Design a protein around this ligand. Structure first.
Ligand SMILES: c1ccc(C[n+]2ccc(N3CCCC3)cc2)cc1
Ligand SMILES: c1ccc(C[n+]2ccc(N3CCCC3)cc2)cc1
Lengths: 348, 348
């Protein structure tokens, strides 16, 4: 798929001006670009030298253009992860977007999250992410700060369309401000270390790296850290466990499938935190008693913070139903997160 | 010097929230802060743990707070230089400023720039800076782009003070638009490689590192990359040579000294580019003949680009005389840069 002419022009000039070697002397007529993801927001394009053009130096042959269609924090963070080889390289930054390394890969599918070696490697990559120093606010205000902002916005919302009006009345009927305070009191009493969290560790943000599919422990990269913050570790892991239940590749309305039965079993959760803990702290030398206590208390921690994954994404999704024009059943998704919230409360 | 109460409060909270280990549990009453530089713009403060407080990990004991009083590019650049150990570590970033490693040091004095070992190390540090890949526009539009912006602003300016009105009329009498085109024709005929330039390599932006004063080749750090861009190498070197003539530490009006005789001699220029060239490009393995040809070519290049240092800082200084409330003789400095411009033209 070719982009619109204005985009091809701007993309050609960004590549020509920001990228070194063969890019600097490239003509408009030699520029290869194709759409990876369309939309009004966060469009992706592959940009490439001709197969016949030789590289002068170490410049890449293809790059990813990301157009926007908080910017400071996200840009600094992307640049830092690039310097530490924990993200794609940053080739160019300008007001309208970035040029990034193109990483030959695909996203994981929902069903791949439960494969033991995939799950063990996500746990190791998340533990690594959790351990790094970032120049951002270390006070864990992100979680309840964000839920309070969305709740405020949710209580102001008026839909005009019938089906959206009825769905919102059902969600509002739960008394979301009271439920939020009950959730705060539970998590206030749930110790969880503050770490640098991805905050959106789903299959769509996990690369299966082409040519590494036979590697047991090094075939993945976590990407798209735009929601990242210092946050309770319990949130990041609980949120990941929730994502086992949601498949965003469903091609008919509401453009997701939810399956409560797909949440990881205690066995699958122990397999994940058993990879996470050695990678985060050594831990393997502790007594079996201490290891068991730590794991059991961590299962409780992540399953409780899983409630905040449901609550935050539920509220987020109601706001998107108002402000987003993306083809997605936001209100149905909100209801699915709240069904899972009350089911998880009953399970606990 | 102690800051204002409001500032002490905000500084305490930034350090407490952004810095790890002992900072996280620090009380207001344990907070040590003192002013390094006042002003309406770019205030600096030292912030410190008590001498009695032990560090829990590898957190710093003291840090520099920088308050502002372009932001994306400058923040990403600072973060990248920190990651590569070419600038101070970045401990925190927020809308009002940054935290930053405290580097025990002082600035060089103008007179130190001509010390052979100081000059050789500035040349090596600038060569290193010139060699690095940065995610910025590589098209060298910065130099004439900036001079055209300042010239446009200079031609709009009306002063209300009589002495400033007369000083501007003399500067305007040179026919700055014609002189800019004479400069364009000279520099368009002068090859100079495009490199990542500091653009402001003066003594005030060169740290003498405390405890390294006996190191021959590693006692300096270049700082304050706020004006950095891809630019003609000739500008960065020519600009540095011009800064041998200007002392900004003079305590009486106009708060600088200018001395045309302090420009580096051919010998001192060859000493600098003799350190620069091996550190930038390999060059070491060329014959004596090839080295001499390249050096003589480079003396031409850098002395011509020196004219653009005079012209750009001259125009900049007229604009600052309008908009800046810093106590400095901006119009006298402008006249000094234009005197040096016409003197350098006559010399060439
Ligand atoms: C642009 C943005 C989003 C989509 C579709 N989509 C995919 C995943 C979505 N979610 C993942 C996080 C919870 C909701 C929401 C919407 C398609 C294009
Ligand atoms: C702090 C801030 C400003 C000043 C004085 N000053 C110093 C240097 C200036 N220049 C920057 C390099 C060329 C002109 C301009 C003004 C002195 C101390």
């Amino acid at each position: 798929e070719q982009p619109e002419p204005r985009t091809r022009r701007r993309a050609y000039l960004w590549c020509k001006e920001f990228l070194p070697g063969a890019w600097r002397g490239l003509r408009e007529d030699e520029f290869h670009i194709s759409v990876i993801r369309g939309g009004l927001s966060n469009m992706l394009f592959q940009c490439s030298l001709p197969d016949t053009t030789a590289t002068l130096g170490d410049e890449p042959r293809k790059v990813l253009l990301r157009l926007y269609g908080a910017m400071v924090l996200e840009s600094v963070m992307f640049a830092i992860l690039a310097e530490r080889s924990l993200g794609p390289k940053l080739y160019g930054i300008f007001p309208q977007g970035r040029l990034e390394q193109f990483i030959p890969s695909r996203r994981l599918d929902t069903e791949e999250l439960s494969l033991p070696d995939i799950s063990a490697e996500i746990a190791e990559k998340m533990a690594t992410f959790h351990g790094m120093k970032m120049p951002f606010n270390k006070e864990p205000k992100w979680l309840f700060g964000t839920m309070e902002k969305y709740l405020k916005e949710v209580l102001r919302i008026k839909f005009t369309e019938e089906s959206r009006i009825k769905k919102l009345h059902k969600l509002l009927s739960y008394n979301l401000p009271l439920e939020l305070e009950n959730l705060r009191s539970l998590l206030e009493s749930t110790p969880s270390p503050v770490v640098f969290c991805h905050n959106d560790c789903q299959e769509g943000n996990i690369l299966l790296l082409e040519g590494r599919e036979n590697s047991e422990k090094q075939k993945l990269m976590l990407i798209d850290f735009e929601y990242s913050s210092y946050n309770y570790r319990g949130f990041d892991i609980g949120n990941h466990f929730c994502e086992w239940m949601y498949d965003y590749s469903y091609e008919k309305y509401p453009f997701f499938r939810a399956n409560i039965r797909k949440y990881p079993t205690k066995k699958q959760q122990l397999h994940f935190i058993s990879s996470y803990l050695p990678a985060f702290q050594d831990f393997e030398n502790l007594s079996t008693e201490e290891k068991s206590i730590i794991k059991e208390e961590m299962l409780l921690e992540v399953n409780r913070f899983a409630l905040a994954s449901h609550f935050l994404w539920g509220l987020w999704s109601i706001v998107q139903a108002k402000i987003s024009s993306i083809e997605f059943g936001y209100m149905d998704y909100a209801q699915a997160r709240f069904d899972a919230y009350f089911h998880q409360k009953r399970k606990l």
